[model samples]
Target: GAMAEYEIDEITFHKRLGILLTSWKNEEDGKTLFQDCDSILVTVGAHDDTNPYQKSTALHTWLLGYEFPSTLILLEKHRITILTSVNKANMLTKLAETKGAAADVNILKRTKDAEENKKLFEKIIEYIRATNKKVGVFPKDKTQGKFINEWDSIFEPVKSEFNLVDASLGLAKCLAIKDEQELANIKGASRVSVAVMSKYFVDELSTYIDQGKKITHSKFSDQMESLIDNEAFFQTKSLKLGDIDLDQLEWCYTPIIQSGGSYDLKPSAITDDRNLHGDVVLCSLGFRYKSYCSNVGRTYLFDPDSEQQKNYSFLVALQKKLFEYCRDGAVIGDIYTKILGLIRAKRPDLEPNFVRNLGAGIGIEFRESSLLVNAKNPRVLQAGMTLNLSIGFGNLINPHPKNSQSKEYALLLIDTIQITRSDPIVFTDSPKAQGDISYFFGED
Candidate 1:
């Protein structure tokens, strides 16, 4: 049952450690703060075998520990990442021994019996409550809304006296920044992203637009998929992939190939149709390296001077301005504000209707919890933090647009960036529409 339940995840212990350790302030008292009696508890479980990783981020984050291959120093004696199963206990204790860190890895064990599992869970809860320690937990409930009455039966005496801090807050603070090693992996992913798509843009993508070739949504996606696997494989050939392989640099969903009216829909809503459409295609692609990911997108205007270029140019400018304000110490909300201001000032007519939802943070998961830097929250930017800094604009030129109507245009520009002490660095740099040497728009 242990093996059966242990679903392999696209996650890294490096990420979990980074998140837990980075969350709390007073790094000077890192040991005093985390090593105290207070504990942060977490458990990973399968959801309907249906709720995917993006939907179950908290569950997936803990599952990553089932087979952690990274250095064990970060998790050493840090009680923050709660040990909840026997599999984790033995593996982590052994990991600590290998790294020569004596971690108290004695209490974790998993169970198949529901009642027994409840007892074990209650025991763990009892220990946390008995110790009179502060605890933090992710604020999601599987019960949807009936949690209090449904859960309190088993968890009643959890005690108001037993402090509980919001673990997600600390998790967000921890996950927002990437350390040096993580930066390398993310950069590697970004390199793979730009390289695979860069050559595709030059050799294959050009032909589709330039020749008006018979490439449908699935056809171009097939081509893009095939090339990405190959190029990405070669990109990370020399990596010492301990828990993963060079061949499995995963695609972050399929390459989104939206053209014509499908531009109004998100990537998930696009039609997997059998027919081919206009050459004006917008392609967004991302792939992961060592569980770290990179995302990049572009709009291929059949005519470089098409009316679509105006929307595309606006996006390009927007991306540049976001980069300027993305450095360390700049408030993320301010950056979100600046982006809104730029859109309002540069394109006044499009401002009223332009609904822009900004991009979030990415790591093992494309949407790491602590990583969003939009106008939605008051998160401050920190050095070593990484985010998918982006802006998107979608306009509907025709209200009752049909399947292939040329009345809707959506342009999205995204890049993976790390905020350093002095300046932020963007990892992906494919050709742009307005560049002196444009890759997609040669006036041939």
Candidate 2:
């Protein structure tokens, strides 16, 4: 045994671990230098389910792990934050609570009694901070699952409403040109349809308002649908004139419908109706395929003689111009600028009352992009992108002759367009131009 020579394995796992620990500790004490810094801002996405506990939990985690000093500014401070999609703040709060950390939370309470909950939230933050815990055990797998769950919860309630409003508008446009007999058929078939769709729009919008999820599209659609659906019903029955045949109508629905489980044309079709008054008939439609949805819209007249016809014709021309310019790689701002130029050149009289975005990004979410003249954005247009282009002209003639200055009638045209490498393709067919005014007059 004394004469034999043996080799030993030189792997030293503990030695490496010990060295790392020592280095970490030494580096911690060596960084004593002070530096001046500029302002630091934290931006986070908010949705319907966001709460005070979640907010505090997120802040605490950031404070514990982040090296920089920063203050979190809540957007639209008075509004309730939505968790329509996965929110980092909510995830962090839940993680902190599960770990029993108690000191790091900063709760912003809605009321006095919320203090107890606030303390609980704080405790969770402390536990997470104390342990220097990672938000997820396996970041890639767990993060995706969390996000999926949050996304579903946030968007499911509103999706149906978006679909309904869009579909109803499309259907209304289809029925817009029907003769009295056809109108009767629509009245019968569409009662349940209208109610079902209208309820969805109102309910979804109410939910957004209650939850505070960027009351942008929800408010616009709610108001627009309310007016168009009601006036559509009235126009179908109250027309003292003769009937227009449905066969002659052009567009019946929006072409590119679903974006993030929602519809785009409900607000789009009524973009010009600032007052949401008058007897305009706007139609929309929507469909769901594999949980995805589609939407479209068309504008109509109960009495072809109504002064709104000129405005409608102008809108149709404007939309056509937009289609011509929506080629691939066109700067979105340039398109907007062109639209403004066309409006001024074609109908300067109506430009004074024009307001709101003329178009918006369309995809899984309607109105997603900030690319508009008012938005002052310079995003380059790309192929495979879809947008809802709405053109409206108002006050072609006063709705109420007594007060001519009051907000009056308008003509609106909204359609979805797909940007292609060569040119933009209109999704919904062009809505028919308002019929000749004489067509509405029954034979004497």
Instruction: Choose the strongest candidate by lDDT.
Output: 1
Per-residue CA lDDT of model 1 for 173-278, tens digit only, reads 5545676766887887887667666665445766665576776777777767776546444545443233344554667666777775456424353436544454
Worst 10 residues of 1 by lDDT: 67-76
Model 1 misplacement above 4 A: 1-38, 46-88, 95-103, 107-122, 131-135, 141-165, 209-212, 226-245, 264-276, 304-306, 353-355, 369-371, 396-405, 435-443
Go through the candidates in order and give the C-alpha RMSD of each one to the true structure.
6.9, 21.3
Name model 2 segments beyond 4 Å from true: 1-278, 291-293, 372-375, 395-407, 436-444
| Model 2 C-alpha lDDT per residue in residues 1-444, reported as the tens digit of each score | 444222211122122222322332343321211011111112232332222112222322222221111122211111112121123333223322223332222323222343453443343333333332222111111112333343344434433422111111111111112223222332322232233234443344334333534433334545544544343433444332124232222112222211111223335333231322223434354322111113444554433444556677777777788788887777777877788888789777777756556666543223333444333756666665556566665444454544523334445555555667786756455325665211231321
Clashes of each: 5, 33
What local distance difference test score does each model get?
0.57, 0.38
